[PDB]
Curated annotation (Swiss-Prot):
Regulation: Requires chloride ions for optimal activity.
Swiss-Prot/TrEMBL site (Transition state stabilizer) positions: D264
Reactions that this protein is recorded to catalyse: Endohydrolysis of (1->4)-alpha-D-glucosidic linkages in polysaccharides containing three or more (1->4)-alpha-linked D-glucose units
Protein name: Alpha-amylase
Gene: amy
Cofactor names: Ca(2+); chloride
Active site: D174 (nucleophile), E200 (proton donor)
Keyword Signal among record annotations: yes
Leading EC class: hydrolase
Temperature-related behavior of activity: Thermolabile.
Enzyme Commission number(s) from the entry: 3.2.1.1
Disulfide bonds: C20-C74, C120-C137, C328-C335, C402-C416
Residues reported to bind Ca(2+): N88, Q135, D144, H178
Length: 448
């Protein structure tokens, strides 16, 4: 059963379509969050995607036909498409867009200067004491749309409904904190049906505008998750994670979208150095295994490119599927969604979705933990310097199981491609996990 989505950051439509068919579908990912498909400013930086010019489907990712082709091919493969939608602003300054349209002085093909709030700057101190400025002033110079206007609402709603008509199943509302929750409620009343909607709201406490204000209009990004998980894995004890979630003051599990890192915080926007990313290698593997095994929120796996320390740089100059070879794992696309520990975690989550309880939690008071998901699965992480050899209790049927983080069950269920884990007649497992390693087993990866 589908439980996890992935952000194919800066991936073009051709690459996404092929990825859906060859990997995402077969591996069980539920959906793909794509980069903004609408017309945006010209330029090679990744952030040009966040400065809209119009709603025509011609962007760095491809043209309208290629976009439609991608939705169709992914849909047939069993994978949904979530579109990153810009509901708060339009591009700053003047220029030309990716579909040839010009703009300048708050004049665009679809908006006039009167469709925006009067210009003012959002200062850092405004976040803590002035909700009016946070929602009516400009985010880093971006023209702030009058989201209370019936015209503006109809225009954004037409775009969303158009995308639904061609097959899009979900939407990410970018910069939601900068738009009054009541404006979003009014916008949603114009949207057909009930697509999956998740709102980007960064709230780590002490904001004049809180994440809780957006719970009635859809799911909300829980940034406390990314930050605390990173902080605990680097500077704390994994044993503290026994009550992770609402117990730590996070929003309701059923309303949260979580992640180890996202495209912004892996670049220092909305997250400090404690955020764990692909650069951390094995540490990133372990952080993902915890997130995917733990029953809190709707997770999304990050899929990045090596930016070589340049936080403004756009993606690689080569496609992922290049003349027969995969441009993954090296200095171009990282493809974390293909890393064995991460893909194995997704498999574990997909196969334990019938039991959302954390059962039989065990820890060594520090960096060795193990817990189950009833009789559906069990896992363990060793982040100490010595082997984890403890005997832990499970609710699983005795037998042989493939450690899904390191391999998988063959078609005839006669063998695994990686190590085998044995569940004893009394439900116990005599662990044998080396330093900075883990194991995960589930009821549907049992040897015959
Ligand atoms: Ca605004
Ligand atoms: Cl996000």
């Amino acid at each position: 059963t589908p439980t996890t989505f992935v952000h194919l950051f800066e991936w073009n439509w051709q690459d996404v379509a092929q990825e859906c068919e060859q990997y995402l579908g077969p591996k069980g990912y539920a959906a793909v969050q794509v980069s903004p498909p609408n017309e945006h400013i010209t330029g090679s930086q990744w952030w040009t995607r966040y400065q809209p010019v119009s709603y025509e489907l011609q962007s760095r990712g491809g043209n309208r036909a290629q976009f439609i082709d991608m939705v169709n091919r992914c849909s047939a493969a069993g994978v949904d498409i979530y579109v990153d939608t810009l509901i708060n602003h339009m591009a700053a300054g003047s220029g030309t867009g990716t579909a040839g349209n010009s703009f300048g002085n708050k004049s665009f093909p679809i908006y006039s200067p009167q469709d925006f709030h009067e210009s003012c700057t959002i200062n850092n101190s405004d976040y803590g004491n002035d909700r009016y400025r946070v929602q009516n002033c400009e985010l880093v110079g971006l023209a702030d749309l009058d989201t209370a206007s019936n015209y503006v609402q109809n225009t954004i709603a037409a775009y969303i409904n158009d995308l639904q008509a061609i097959g899009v199943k979900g939407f990410r509302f970018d910069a939601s904190k900068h738009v009054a929750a009541s404006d979003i409620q009014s916008l949603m009343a114009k949207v057909n049906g009930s697509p999956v909607v998740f709102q980007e709201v960064i709230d780590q406490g002490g904001e004049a505008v809180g994440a809780s204000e957006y719970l009635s209009t859809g799911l909300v990004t829980e940034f406390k998750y990314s930050t605390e998980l990173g902080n605990t894995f680097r500077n704390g004890s994994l044993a503290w994670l026994s009550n992770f979630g609402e117990g730590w003051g996070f929003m309701p599990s059923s309303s949260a979208v979580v992640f180890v890192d996202n495209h912004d915080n892996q670049r220092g926007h909305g997250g400090a150095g404690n955020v764990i990313t692909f650069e951390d290698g094995r540490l990133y593997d372990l952080a993902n295994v915890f997130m995917l095994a733990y029953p809190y929120g709707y997770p999304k796996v990050m899929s990045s490119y090596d930016f070589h320390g340049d936080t403004d740089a756009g993606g690689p100059n080569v496609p992922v599927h290049n003349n027969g070879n995969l441009e993954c794992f090296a200095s171009n696309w990282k493809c974390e969604h293909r890393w064995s520990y991460i893909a194995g975690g997704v498999d574990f989550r997909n196969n334990t979705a019938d039991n959302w309880a954390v059962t039989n939690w065990w820890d060594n008071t520090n960096n060795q933990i193990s817990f189950g998901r009833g009789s559906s699965g069990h896992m363990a992480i060793n982040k100490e310097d010595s082997t984890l050899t403890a005997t832990v209790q499970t609710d699983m049927a005795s037998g042989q199981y493939c450690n899904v983080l390191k391999g998988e069950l063959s078609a005839d269920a006669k063998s695994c491609s990686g190590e085998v884990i044995t569940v004893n007649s009394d439900g116990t497992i005599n662990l044998n996990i080396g330093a900075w390693d883990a194991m995960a087993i589930h009821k549907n990866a049992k040897l015959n």
